[PDB]
């Protein structure tokens, strides 16, 4: 599995963490209280 | 003419005259005294 | 009045003044069939909570991405096929 | 190699005068004047010197013309604004007769 | 503050999109945040430092973890000269099978990246001979990162919240940092080198399960308490030692034999141990200097009020300087970055010459990557030191509290300083460019005997003043009769002489006229960067064109087209143009380094000594020639391992050109263009439904300047990294 | 309490064949700065939104984009055509704020009835350094 | 938005406000000069920051002075 | 017929043949972007279906595995992924632009001057229904394009 962990983490990190991060940060930008 | 000499004394005309004279000086020195790296007189 | 001769500052109708117009926003009724519309309503009402839609989208998409990249073999992406070639010895021996 | 410029041997720049060819040391020009001159049937250097002198003459003539047409007898605005005659002349008289005279040279 | 910037309600009350950029860019400018105090400022700084330490330990843990997991370190330990380091494996799903085949190095079952960071050499020199060692180290550094994080969290809570009177305790802090953080720290490093690294070099592995039993020296601490310290320098690995095995090893732990280890061409671990020990004594003694809660010591305030020279040359001396530094965080930061940049350049200049890691001198890409790295880092740190001094002179400098003092008398003759630095840079640039151009011409005229070649007699004199007999000056160390040679005749000079005279290593290289000329180019660069920065810092408060510049702050675009024009008048813009000149200077430094060293390694020092004296040699014999194997990293017919470096080379070219967009083009053409774009989007059907929330605007002038410099510097750095790494890796000499 | 606002009525607008520099969505959610002027004759003038317009004999009315547009127009009017002008600010709610003279007189003639604000009774060098106002909302120039 | 300030060195030449394209400034009476008038800046909300005012202030350095500050939609000069 | 928008010359647009014509305005008015009267869910369904096919187009034939046997399947998979991302960005758009319950920010007027009802698409729940329709329609259009590439491969071009 250790050879299969980059295949799980690189698509996880470099695509989802941009999804999560850029989405949440765009929401934090476009906010009002 | 006074004004022609006033123009000849202007900065660019006098600059090109001065640097043409100077350049001819250094040119003729580097033709008469070419290829000079060391001052050999009283060396 | 906005419709007078070259008058464009009806102070009461500020929408016509500022340009607030549905330039192509037809208010014509639903041209779809009612039955397929009800079908889509009942089959897409799960995607009505934008927050739950976003959580589902992010989590399920990341899960499917990890699943594809973990279950895919080297036949569909050469990085998992591996070298399948002997390694070249670098310059100066290997250093 | 077509060459039309030679440098003065002073500071080692005489290396620029190279083996262009023709028993001649100079700079290989890339202007195509030699090609024109073969197309103009020059076949000499006398013709080129005469052309240079005639061109110097026309340069002095144009200098006198600018002086005359500003200081001595300068056209007023009705003359430039007559663009009809200007086009009639520059089409027929500059470009027409110019191409005709060059066709005469070419023939 | 209502919108995303919670720390500035002036940017939250900005309907445009400038607020996003300025909430990114001022996020860490706490003393400009709205409705804050000095307490909150220092406390946010303290928590930020905790976060920085957490990131540092995390990044080191990532390095260790990836070298242990995806590396070949256990193979590198055996045959280090002929086994390639491995930074980390690569899973790039865009890769084609030729690229999967080419990037498989170091005896790996998959693609990998070669560690051009030297971490292999430095971990191997300090013990750490297994992957489990690196795993334990990475886990411990992860624990340390979590420790820093919880520390910075709790030190923000109101119960554990230090007051400004605690941050300003510049004597207890100095004593503690000196004594512990330097002296005890280097002492603990010696206690590693003596207990672990030297035994790991001498053979046996000394680990946590057995480090209490293993005597580091066969007579444990008797020699130390009895004063017979010479018993720790008895068998100093007498010249036949293989690093990592007991053959030709010894028993010493602390020596001053100097020179290099013959196998590794690196410094002796016993020398490093004795070194860190000695400087530990010095720092532990110096950290008992400043006055604290125990009645003795110095008050830096009175040390400064006492160092006022009678004669009024300096005027009021250093009076009122403790209060203007301790209150001013920007002054502390500027002095800190000054010292840090100088010692970073020192790290570079001494790691290339005096490598302290096993088998890092003989590998040739790490020794260049590290030097280039630390020198660009030093240049940036130095620009930042000056920029923070400028920010101090604007924000934190009180001219009344330090009237007529060394600092006030300094700002007086700012015109003198600026003019004489201008003179130095103008002189150097004129002359040295003239000489490089004279030599360019003299080669272009086929007369290389007419070149201006000045032998660097002074640097050659210093070299011969250290034991280099390649010139024949015979002065103070090459003269056997000199008392300096007689003093250390029996301590270090045999090793140091057979090191410095050995023309294979890289300390005190045989220098020539090209070295003179490029050293003067370096002086031009340093004096000019210094000119730009000093001029911005001293004209930060004002000048004749803008005397109330302190009221506009450190970073502001301009003052308008009035008064002739005021583009790039702020001290921030001085920093800006100084970053340009800094990149230029470090480029000269690292070009000089890389060419001298690649010619030494290849063997043809004559290439540099003949071609470095005229710029077309650098353009031909350094850039055009060493870029042969790089740009062929991927041809129309196949690729090789240097494909990534060619792609990075072109990527850096691309951003270095994109910066010219933000620099050459300025704001107004883009605002008008965005106005047209906004018209089109608001009148384009099916996109009228979509309306922005932040009104789009072209980038502010200071912003776009910063962005152009970011692209410019990223391209500078990535391009030269690609070129350096690929040229030194395409051949390894 | 000496000059009342004018409360622009439904006046005609200039003859103009329409441009793209006009009112965007800023007017639909924010102010849009109507201007009113009074022409002696039906003459032609450059619009600040690009293009040529034909002002009408008598009162005119233009709702262009913003303050600088109407004030540039009015300065060109007053200098080139020698004509009195006054412009407003029309929020989307409905209010119409009068702005250009705010006294019936242009802001060059120092006519009494206006209170001086943005007025620091000192030379420009006698402002305190930022350290003297560190950690305070007043930046350098409001004491 | 921007913070325009008029200092007491003003001679009352009315160029600051005759150059200002956004009606930010206005001359008021004063007793500190031969012209008996000084400029004031009430409508700083309409201030774009173009510094045409201080490109026309004929004094030692300046009397009118524009300080760049919180930029809003009207100080940024946006028609959108 | 380039007279200005609604004959209003100081609005930044014109009623040229491209914008305001019997054919092109009709086409832009009877498609699911501008059906302000019908609920946004059917609109989003139509939109998502169309864009799902439009995205499956340049993923099977143009892509990293276009020449392989995994061209259609993996290309449709990438198209569904892009569709999921488009619904994602649409979702953050609906969250960021309008909060929960405000009235519609759409114009309540038309060219003819009728005080029409505002487009409930621009509301929070309306845009959410539109996003749900877009996601459903897009995944459905992706799989239907895959189905048509599977069972009806011969009439379409392979090249
Ligand atoms: C700042 C330090 C640092 C850096 C720069 C990297 C960098 C990298 N890691 Mg590593 N990693 C680190 C610390 C670090 N790691 C630590 C501390 C752990 C233990 C928790 C891991 C565990 C780890 C795994 C298990 C994997 C990576 C992988 C990767 C690569 C892709 C990014 C990713 O998915 O990471 C994910 C990392 C984390 C979520 C840990 C963040 C803390 C990249 C080369 C992947 C790889 O091998 O690609 C080649 C992979 O599969 N990392
Ligand atoms: C289309 C071009 C392309 C793309 C997209 C990639 C993509 C990738 N390559 Mg690259 N690569 C390419 C071409 C490309 N490659 C080419 C042509 C070559 C030469 C043959 C290589 C050679 C190569 C090597 C040698 C390696 C990679 C690696 C990687 C992976 C890095 C892991 C990651 O998630 O990074 C995450 C992104 C970063 C670390 C970038 C940091 C800087 C960002 C921009 C700033 C972030 C801003 C802020 C702080 C954070 C806020 C959140 C943010 C998301 C907005 C990634 C999958 C590595 C790998 O496989 O390890 C896993 C690796 O070692 N590639
Ligand atoms: C600043 C850098 C620099 C330096 C130091 C030099 C230096 C030199 N160059 Mg190089 N050169 C440079 C830049 C530089 N050059 C650049 C930028 C270019 C490209 C434009 C060139 C192109 C170039 C060429 C192509 C050549 C040189 C040559 C020379 C030599 C000139 C010797 C000579 O003729 O002087 C002799 C002295 C004079 C001309 C000055 C005479 C002054 C008069 C007589 C007044 C003094 C008398 C006065 C009355 C006082 C007397 C005392 C009493 C009365 C009080 C010298 C080694 C030449 C050479 O021989 O190379 C080795 C040569 O061929 N250079
Ligand atoms: C900086 C200005 C400049 C310079 C230094 C040159 C330099 C050169 N040109 Mg170029 N050229 C220029 C501008 C310039 N040109 C422009 C703006 C035009 C467009 C009209 C041309 C058109 C042009 C042509 C067509 C040719 C050159 C040639 C040449 C070379 C020979 C010079 C010559 O007079 O031969 C003698 C000149 C000619 C044989 C040209 C014939 C006359 C042309 C076709 C039209 C007549 C001009 C007309 C009255 C004015 C324009 C009318 C209007 C309706 C457009 C030399 C490299 C010639 C060359 O490369 O030969 C190897 C060549 O064949 N040039
Ligand atoms: C002896 C007690 C002691 C010790 C050990 C420390 C330790 C530290 N303090 Mg200090 N502190 C103390 C007492 C102490 N403090 C007291 C009494 C006060 C009272 C006011 C403070 C107030 C204080 C403040 C206000 C701050 C600190 C900070 C720090 C941290 C500095 C950042 C860092 O790690 O770089 C350490 C750097 C070095 C050890 C060496 C740097 C230079 C050497 C010479 C370079 C050359 C060798 C090089 C390292 C070799 C590398 C080779 C290879 C291994 C890579 C560090 C953990 C900062 C921090 O991070 O907050 C937590 C901070 O902001 N301290
Ligand atoms: C902070 C650094 C540090 C620490 C924690 C230790 C800790 C220890 N040392 Mg070491 N040691 C150090 C620095 C350090 N030493 C240095 C700098 C030297 C060289 C002067 C030595 C030389 C040394 C010897 C020669 C011996 C120890 C021994 C010991 C152990 C018992 C000492 C009572 C203990 C584990 C003894 C042991 O058995 O282990 C032992 O015999 N130490
Ligand atoms: C110990 C190191 C250190 C520390 C603590 C600081 C801290 C600070 N700097 Mg200094 N600075 C440093 C190093 C440091 N800098 C270096 C090395 C340089 C040279 C490049 C500079 C150059 C510099 C300038 C020119 C300016 C600052 C500014 C600032 C402040 C705001 C920074 C911010 O929020 O931007 C956040 C920045 C970003 C989000 C992006 C930066 C872009 C790069 C490409 C990212 C990497 C803050 C007090 C500013 C200030 O005080 O305002 C008055 C300011 O104008 N710094
Ligand atoms: C190759 C590019 C280049 C060059 C030549 C220079 C040159 C200079 N810069 Mg730098 N600079 C550059 C790029 C460059 N810069 C870039 C990209 C930036 C970023 C914006 C800056 C930012 C910058 C700042 C911020 C500062 C400088 C300064 C200086 C001057 C330093 C003094 C010195 O060495 O001058 C010696 C003279 C030269 C190098 C000029 C070389 C040309 C020769 C000698 C002229 C003679 C040739 C010929 C006879 C003339 C006739 C030509 C033709 C008309 C026929 C000098 C003029 C500093 C300064 O002014 O200090 C005084 C300063 O403060 N520059
Ligand atoms: C890079 C451009 C590109 C490519 C390679 C494809 C490729 C394809 N399209 Mg798509 N398509 C595209 C752009 C593209 N399309 C665009 C811009 C439109 C208009 C919006 C369409 C509209 C379209 C329709 C309406 C249909 C296709 C279909 C197809 C397939 C068979 C066509 C015979 C094929 C996979 C057909 C299909 O069923 O796909 C399987 C089909 O019915 N395409
Ligand atoms: C702006 C400013 C700032 C900053 C600045 C800077 C950044 C600076 C830098 C500086 C630097 C960076 C410096 C350096 C210096 C150096 C020196 C001064 C050196 C010396 C040396 C010596 C003295 C030596 C000796 C010796 C030798 C020769 C060798 C051997 C040994 C012996 C020891 C014998 C501040 C904040 C402060 C303040 C404000 C202003
Ligand atoms: S331009 Fe300056 S001096 Fe003239 S009136 Fe205005 S503020 Fe006074």
């Amino acid at each position: 599995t250790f050879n299969n962990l980059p295949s799980i983490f690189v698509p996880l990190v470099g695509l989802v963490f941009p999804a999560i991060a850029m989405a949440s940060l765009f929401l934090h930008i476009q906010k009002n209280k | 003419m006074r004004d022609l000499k006033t123009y000849l004394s202007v900065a660019p005309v006098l600059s090109t005259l001065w640097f043409g004279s100077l350049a001819g000086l250094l040119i003729e020195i580097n033709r008469l005294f070419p290829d000079a790296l060391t001052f050999p007189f009283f060396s | 009045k906005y419709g007078d001769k070259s008058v464009y500052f009806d102070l009461e109708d500020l929408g016509n003044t500022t340009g607030q117009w549905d330039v192509y926003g037809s208010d014509a009724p639903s041209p779809y069939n009612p039955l397929q519309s009800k079908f889509f309503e009942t089959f897409a009402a799960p995607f009505t909570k934008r927050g739950l839609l976003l959580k589902f989208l992010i989590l399920g998409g990341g899960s499917l991405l990890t699943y594809v990249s973990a279950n895919s073999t080297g036949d569909v992406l050469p990085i998992k096929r591996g070298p399948q070639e002997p390694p070249k010895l670098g310059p100066r021996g290997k250093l | 190699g077509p060459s039309a410029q030679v440098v003065w041997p002073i500071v080692g720049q005489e290396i620029l005068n190279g083996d262009v060819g023709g028993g001649f040391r100079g700079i290989q020009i890339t202007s195509g004047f030699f090609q024109i001159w073969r197309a103009s049937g020059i076949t000499s250097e006398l013709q080129l010197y005469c052309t240079a002198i005639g061109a110097l003459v026309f340069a002095a003539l144009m200098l006198f013309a600018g002086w005359f047409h500003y200081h001595k007898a300068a056209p007023k605005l009705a003359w430039f604004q007559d663009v009809e005659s200007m086009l009639n002349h520059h089409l027929a008289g500059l470009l027409g007769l110019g191409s005709l005279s060059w066709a005469g040279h070419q023939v | 503050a209502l919108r995303f910037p919670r720390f500035s309600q002036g940017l939250a009350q900005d309907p445009t999109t400038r607020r996003i950029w300025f909430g990114i860019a001022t996020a860490h400018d706490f003393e400009s945040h709205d409705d804050i105090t000095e307490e909150r400022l220092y406390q946010n700084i303290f928590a930020s430092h905790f976060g920085q330490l957490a990131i540092i330990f995390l990044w080191t843990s990532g390095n260790l973890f990836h070298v242990a997991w995806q590396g070949n370190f256990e193979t590198w330990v055996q045959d280090p000269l002929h086994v390639r380091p491995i930074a980390h494996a690569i899973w790039d799903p865009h890769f084609g099978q030729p690229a999967v085949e080419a990037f498989t190095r170091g005896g790996a079952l998959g693609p990998v990246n070669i560690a051009y960071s030297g971490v292999y050499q430095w971990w191997y020199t300090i013990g750490l001979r297994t992957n489990e060692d690196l795993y334990t180290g990475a886990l411990f550094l992860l624990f340390l990162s979590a420790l820093s994080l919880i520390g910075g969290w709790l030190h923000l809570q109101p119960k554990w919240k230090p007051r400004v009177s605690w941050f300003k305790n510049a004597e207890s802090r100095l004593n503690h940092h000196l004594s512990g953080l330097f002296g005890v720290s280097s002492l603990a490093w010696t206690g590693h080198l003596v207990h672990v690294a030297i035994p790991a070099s001498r053979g046996e592995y000394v680990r946590w399960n057995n480090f209490l039993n293993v005597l580091p020296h066969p007579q444990g601490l008797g020699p130390l308490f009895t004063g017979q310290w010479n018993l720790y320098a008895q068998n100093p690995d007498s010249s036949s030692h293989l690093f990592g095995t007991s053959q030709g090893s010894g028993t010493a732990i602390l020596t001053l034999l100097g020179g290099f280890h013959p196998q590794t061409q690196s410094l002796w671990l016993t020398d490093m141990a004795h070194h860190h020990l000695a400087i530990a004594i010095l720092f532990l003694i110096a950290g008992h200097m400043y006055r604290t809660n125990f009645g003795i010591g110095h008050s830096i305030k009175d040390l400064l009020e006492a160092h006022i020279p009678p004669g009024g040359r300096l005027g009021r001396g250093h009076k009122g300087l403790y209060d203007t530094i301790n209150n001013s965080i920007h002054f502390q930061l500027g002095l800190a970055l000054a010292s840090l940049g100088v010692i970073t350049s020192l790290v570079a200049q001494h790691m290339y010459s005096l490598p302290a890691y096993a088998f890092i001198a003989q590998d040739f890409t790490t020794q260049a990557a590290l030097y280039t790295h630390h020198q660009y880092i030093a240049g940036f740190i130095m620009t930042g030191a000056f920029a923070h001094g400028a920010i101090f002179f604007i924000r934190d400098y009180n001219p009344e509290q330090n009237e007529d003092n060394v600092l006030a008398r300094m700002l007086d003759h700012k015109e003198a300083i600026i003019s004489h630095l201008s003179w130095a840079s103008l002189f150097l640039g004129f002359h040295t460019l003239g000489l490089y151009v004279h030599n360019d011409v003299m080669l272009a005229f086929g007369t290389p005997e007419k070149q201006i070649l000045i032998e660097p007699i002074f640097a050659q004199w210093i070299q011969s003043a250290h034991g280099k007999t390649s010139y024949g000056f015979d002065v103070l160390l090459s003269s056997t009769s000199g008392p300096a040679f007689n003093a250390g005749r029996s301590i270090w000079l045999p090793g140091w002489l057979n090191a410095i005279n050995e023309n294979s290593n890289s300390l005190f290289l045989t220098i020539g006229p090209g070295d003179f000329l490029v050293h003067h180019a370096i002086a031009l660069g340093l004096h000019t960067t210094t000119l730009i920065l000093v001029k911005g810092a001293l004209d930060a408060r004002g000048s004749k064109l803008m005397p109330d510049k302190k009221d506009f702050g450190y970073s502001f675009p301009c003052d308008g087209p009035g008064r002739g024009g005021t583009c790039d008048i702020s001290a921030w813009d001085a920093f800006y143009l100084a970053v340009f000149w800094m990149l230029n200077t470090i480029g000269w430094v690292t070009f000089y380094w890389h060419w001298k060293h690649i010619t030494l390694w290849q063997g043809n020092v004559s290439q540099f000594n003949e071609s470095s004296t005229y710029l077309m040699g650098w353009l031909r014999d350094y850039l055009w020639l060493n870029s042969s194997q790089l740009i062929n990293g991927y041809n129309p017919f196949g690729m090789n391992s240097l494909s990534v470096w060619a792609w990075m080379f072109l990527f850096g070219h691309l951003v270095w050109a994109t910066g010219f967009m933000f620099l050459i083009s300025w704001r107004g053409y883009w605002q008008e263009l965005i106005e047209t774009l906004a018209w089109a989007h608001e009148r384009t059907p099916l996109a009228n439904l979509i309306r922005w929330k932040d009104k789009p605007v072209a980038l502010s002038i200071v912003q776009a300047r910063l962005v152009g410099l970011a692209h410019f510097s990223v391209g500078y750095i990535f391009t030269y990294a690609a070129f350096l790494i690929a040229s030194t890796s395409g051949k390894f000499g | 309490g000496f000059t009342p606002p004018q409360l622009d009525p439904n006046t005609p607008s200039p003859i103009f064949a329409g441009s793209t520099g006009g009112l965007l969505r800023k007017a639909q959610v924010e102010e849009f700065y109507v201007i009113t002027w009074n022409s002696p004759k039906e003459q032609i003038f450059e619009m600040p939104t690009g293009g040529a317009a034909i002002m009408r004999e008598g009162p005119n009315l233009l709702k262009l984009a913003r303050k600088e547009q109407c004030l540039a127009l009015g300065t060109r009017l007053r200098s080139k055509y020698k004509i009195t002008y006054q412009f407003y600010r029309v929020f989307p709610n409905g209010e119409v704020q009068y702005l250009h003279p705010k006294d019936g007189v242009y802001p060059e003639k120092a006519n009494p009835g206006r209170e001086g604000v943005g007025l620091n009774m000192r030379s420009i060098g006698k402002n305190v350094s930022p350290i003297e106002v560190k950690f305070t909302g007043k930046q350098s120039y409001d004491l | 938005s921007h913070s325009v300030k008029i200092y007491d060195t003003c001679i009352g030449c009315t160029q600051c406000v005759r150059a200002c394209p956004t009606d930010v400034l206005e001359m008021i009476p004063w007793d500190g000069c031969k012209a008996k008038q000084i400029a004031s800046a009430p409508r700083t909300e309409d201030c774009v920051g173009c510094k045409r005012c201080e490109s026309a202030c004929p004094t030692d350095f300046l009397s009118v002075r524009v300080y760049l500050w919180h930029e809003t939609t009207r100080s940024m000069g946006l028609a959108y | 017929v380039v007279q200005p928008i609604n004959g209003d010359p100081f609005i930044g647009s014109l009623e040229t043949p491209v914008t305001s014509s019997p054919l092109i305005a009709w086409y832009l008015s009877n498609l699911p972007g501008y059906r302000t009267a019908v609920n946004p869910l059917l609109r989003g369904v139509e939109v998502g279906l169309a864009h799902g096919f439009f995205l499956v187009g340049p993923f099977v034939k143009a892509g990293p595995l276009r020449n392989t046997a995994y061209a259609g399947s993996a290309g449709s998979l990438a198209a569904a992924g892009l569709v999921v991302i488009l619904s994602m960005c649409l979702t953050i758009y609906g969250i960021s632009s309008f909060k929960e319950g405000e009235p519609s920010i759409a114009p309540s007027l038309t060219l003819t001057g009728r005080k029409k009802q505002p487009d409930q698409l621009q509301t929070a729940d309306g845009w959410a229904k539109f996003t749900g329709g877009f996601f459903f329609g897009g995944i459905s259009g992706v799989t239907w394009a895959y189905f048509l590439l599977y069972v009806l491969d011969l009439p379409y071009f392979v090249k």
Side-chain angles (χ1 to χ4, degrees), chain C residues 1-10, chain F residues 10-13 56, chain H residues 7:
Chain C
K1 183 67 193 308
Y2 186 78
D4 274 336
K5 175 51 151 68
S6 79
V7 180
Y8 308 99
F9 184 58
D10 200 18
Chain F
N10 54 358
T11 59
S13 273
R56 292 166 173 276

Side-chain angles (χ1 to χ4, degrees), chain E residues 41 394-399 541 548 550-551 679 682-683 691 695, chain F residues 20 23-26 30 124 127-132 134-135 140:
Chain E
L41 162 61
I394 277 167
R395 285 183 168 170
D396 291 348
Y397 178 68
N398 206 337
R541 297 186 69 74
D548 59 352
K550 61 195 186 293
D551 305 334
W679 174 91
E682 266 166 357
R683 300 297 188 275
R691 56 214 64 178
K695 298 181 162 180
Chain F
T20 56
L23 295 166
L24 309 179
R25 205 178 155 282
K26 197 214 186 187
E30 297 166 12
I124 200 165
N127 302 293
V128 305
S129 311
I131 183 61
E132 298 295 343
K134 203 89 171 291
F135 315 124
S140 191

Side-chain angles (χ1 to χ4, degrees), chain C residues 2 8 13 15-17 20-22 24-28 30-32 37 43 47-48 50 53-54 57-58 75-76, chain H residues 7-8 11 19 29 34-38 42 46 70 91-92 94-95 98-100 107 109-110 114 116 128 132:
Chain C
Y2 186 78
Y8 308 99
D13 209 355
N16 284 319
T17 290
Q20 290 180 11
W21 297 310
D22 289 349
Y24 318 97
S26 86
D27 63 334
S30 188
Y32 313 106
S37 63
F43 276 36
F47 314 97
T48 194
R50 61 195 199 178
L53 168 55
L54 181 137
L57 268 167
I58 297 180
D75 63 331
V76 294
Chain H
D8 208 331
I11 308 305
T19 83
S29 75
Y34 279 102
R35 295 224 188 75
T36 173
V38 71
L42 313 180
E46 201 181 339
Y70 308 91
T91 311
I92 72 184
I95 297 156
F98 30 79
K99 300 297 205 154
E100 293 308 337
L109 295 174
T110 179
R114 285 164 42 256
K116 58 175 290 305

Side-chain angles (χ1 to χ4, degrees), chain D residues 31-33 36 95:
Chain D
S31 312
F33 257 105
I36 286 150
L95 302 159

